[PDB]
Design an enzyme around this catalytic site. Structure first.
Site, mmCIF file in Angstrom:
data_model
loop_
_atom_site.group_PDB
_atom_site.id
_atom_site.type_symbol
_atom_site.label_atom_id
_atom_site.label_comp_id
_atom_site.label_asym_id
_atom_site.label_seq_id
_atom_site.Cartn_x
_atom_site.Cartn_y
_atom_site.Cartn_z
ATOM 1 N N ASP A 37 49.043 42.573 54.745
ATOM 2 C CA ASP A 37 49.042 42.109 53.368
ATOM 3 C C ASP A 37 49.615 40.698 53.266
ATOM 4 O OD1 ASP A 37 49.261 41.786 50.607
ATOM 5 O OD2 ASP A 37 51.007 43.109 50.431
ATOM 6 N N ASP A 222 44.787 37.329 48.928
ATOM 7 C CA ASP A 222 45.595 38.532 49.057
ATOM 8 C C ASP A 222 44.864 39.617 49.827
ATOM 9 O OD1 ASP A 222 47.430 40.579 48.796
ATOM 10 O OD2 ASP A 222 47.528 40.483 46.618
HETATM 11 C C1 LIG Z 1 45.922 54.070 46.154
HETATM 12 C C2 LIG Z 1 47.102 54.180 46.888
HETATM 13 C C3 LIG Z 1 47.736 53.052 47.390
HETATM 14 C C4 LIG Z 1 47.167 51.798 47.149
HETATM 15 C C5 LIG Z 1 47.793 50.574 47.696
HETATM 16 N N1 LIG Z 1 46.947 49.719 48.270
HETATM 17 C C6 LIG Z 1 47.331 48.580 48.821
HETATM 18 N N2 LIG Z 1 46.385 47.745 49.393
HETATM 19 C C7 LIG Z 1 44.960 48.108 49.456
HETATM 20 C C8 LIG Z 1 44.265 47.139 50.368
HETATM 21 C C9 LIG Z 1 44.406 47.085 51.699
HETATM 22 C C10 LIG Z 1 43.582 46.031 52.142
HETATM 23 C C11 LIG Z 1 42.974 45.510 51.060
HETATM 24 O O1 LIG Z 1 43.402 46.180 49.985
HETATM 25 C C12 LIG Z 1 48.726 48.273 48.806
HETATM 26 C C13 LIG Z 1 49.245 47.089 49.371
HETATM 27 C C14 LIG Z 1 50.594 46.863 49.322
HETATM 28 C C15 LIG Z 1 51.451 47.797 48.726
HETATM 29 C C16 LIG Z 1 50.994 48.953 48.157
HETATM 30 C C17 LIG Z 1 49.613 49.226 48.186
HETATM 31 N N3 LIG Z 1 49.106 50.361 47.647
HETATM 32 C C18 LIG Z 1 45.963 51.697 46.426
HETATM 33 C C19 LIG Z 1 45.344 52.831 45.921
#
Ligand SMILES: c1ccc(-c2nc(NCc3ccco3)c3ccccc3n2)cc1
Ligand SMILES: *[C@@H]1O[C@H](CO)[C@@H](O[C@@H]2O[C@H](CO)[C@@H](O)[C@H](O)[C@H]2NC(C)=O)[C@H](O)[C@H]1NC(C)=O
Length: 336
Positions: A37, A222
């Protein structure tokens, strides 16, 4: 100091919304699925110390310090607040392997992990690829620790995110220390960062079919965001122009209208970065009586980083992205 190493991390694409790869923590290695991330700078994974009353901890891999002979206790509390949720726990140090690079890394052992949203995470944790300036607790980020080893050929890393599919398809790929010309074509075009410390660039306009960002705005690039996001007022205007209807967490159009929605273009540096409706509509049907969600969301990111747009997986799928730490710039090229 620069070496001759580049390393690649193979990524899995879960439903075009979560791209994650594998890291090993401790001795012997405990493996975790992690999102890489650029929007954040801390490493965390769920802890064995997470109460099982957190059902998310029941459903994910838990780091057990008591099984690692290379673990070094720290115990400072930390809370990491993301746009979609929060985790809390404490700092630990251990050996982390990422793409066959081994690094001694301070990370969060998460003991509080809300069921919403983390029960919906296929991944276990997060590897922040942002700068030390945004690290909670001033924890040296993993990429900085990799750079200190002097093995990487360049002080850059690159992201390829594939379209989903079947299992033989590559979900995505991070190249540490370079880029992979197998996953892009044409030339990189570079935009300098607004400032060092955040992977954010100036954006000169957003066009639907120049409706928005007419006097410039910000774009956080991002890799941990599923979607392209703008501010509520930007997205309200964007979506009115698409004829999209707001729901609680997303916007939808009637599926039959999805294919003929207009292009959306993002003016970054010298170039226009254009998405067609195929790039931002989840075309799960062609029915006039079904609703199809859009891969563009409202997200009010608070200052000092926001108000800002975020260019997430929706954007990166189309444009192979190089994050250049040496020159404080981001390069985009057409993904293949
Ligand atoms: C359900 C459950 C959890 C998430 C979710 N998703 C994140 N990133 C998604 C992603 C990865 C690559 C591109 O996008 C995320 C990143 C950082 C901290 C928390 C995060 N929580 C989303 C939906
Ligand atoms: C957790 O890690 C922090 C950061 O490395 C440690 O804080 C340092 O402690 C030493 C003395 O032991 C000081 O000289 C440094 O100035 C501190 N640095 C910072 C940034 O605060 C801390 O000691 C560790 N805690 C434990 C219990 O291991």
């Amino acid at each position: 100091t620069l070496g001759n190493t580049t390393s690649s991390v193979i990524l899995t694409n879960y439903m075009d919304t979560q791209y994650y790869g594998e890291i090993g923590i401790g001795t012997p290695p405990q493996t975790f699925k992690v999102v890489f991330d650029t929007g954040s700078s801390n490493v965390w994974v769920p802890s064995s110390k997470c109460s099982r009353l957190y059902t998310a901890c029941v459903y994910h891999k838990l780091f057990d310090a008591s099984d690692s002979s290379s673990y070094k206790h720290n115990g400072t509390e930390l809370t990491l607040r993301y746009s979609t949720g929060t985790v809390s726990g404490f700092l630990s140090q251990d050996i982390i392997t990422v793409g066959g690079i081994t690094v001694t890394q301070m990370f969060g052992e998460v003991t509080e992990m809300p069921a919403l949203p983390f029960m919906l995470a296929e991944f276990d944790g997060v590897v922040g690829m942002g700068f030390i300036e945004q690290a909670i607790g001033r924890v040296t980020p993993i990429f900085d620790n990799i750079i200190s080893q002097g093995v990487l050929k360049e002080d850059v890393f690159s992201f390829y995110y594939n379209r989903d599919s079947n299992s033989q398809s590559l979900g995505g790929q991070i190249v540490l220390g370079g880029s992979d010309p197998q996953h892009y074509e044409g030339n990189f075009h570079y935009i300098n960062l607004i400032k060092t410390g955040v992977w954010q660039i100036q954006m000169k306009g957003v066009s639907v079919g120049t409706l928005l960002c007419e006097d410039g705005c910000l774009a956080l690039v991002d890799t941990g965001a599923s979607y392209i996001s703008g501010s509520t007022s930007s997205i309200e205007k964007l979506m009115e122009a698409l004829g999209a209807k707001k729901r609680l967490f997303d916007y939808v159009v009637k599926c039959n209208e999805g294919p003929t929605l207009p292009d959306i273009s993002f003016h970054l540096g010298g170039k226009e970065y254009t998405l067609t409706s195929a790039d931002y509509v989840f075309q799960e049907s062609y029915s006039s009586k079904k609703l199809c969600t859009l891969a563009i969301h409202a997200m009010d990111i608070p200052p000092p980083t926001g108000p800002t747009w975020a260019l997430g997986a929706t954007f990166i799928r189309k444009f192979y992205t190089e994050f250049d730490r040496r020159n404080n710039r981001i390069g985009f090229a057409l993904a293949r």
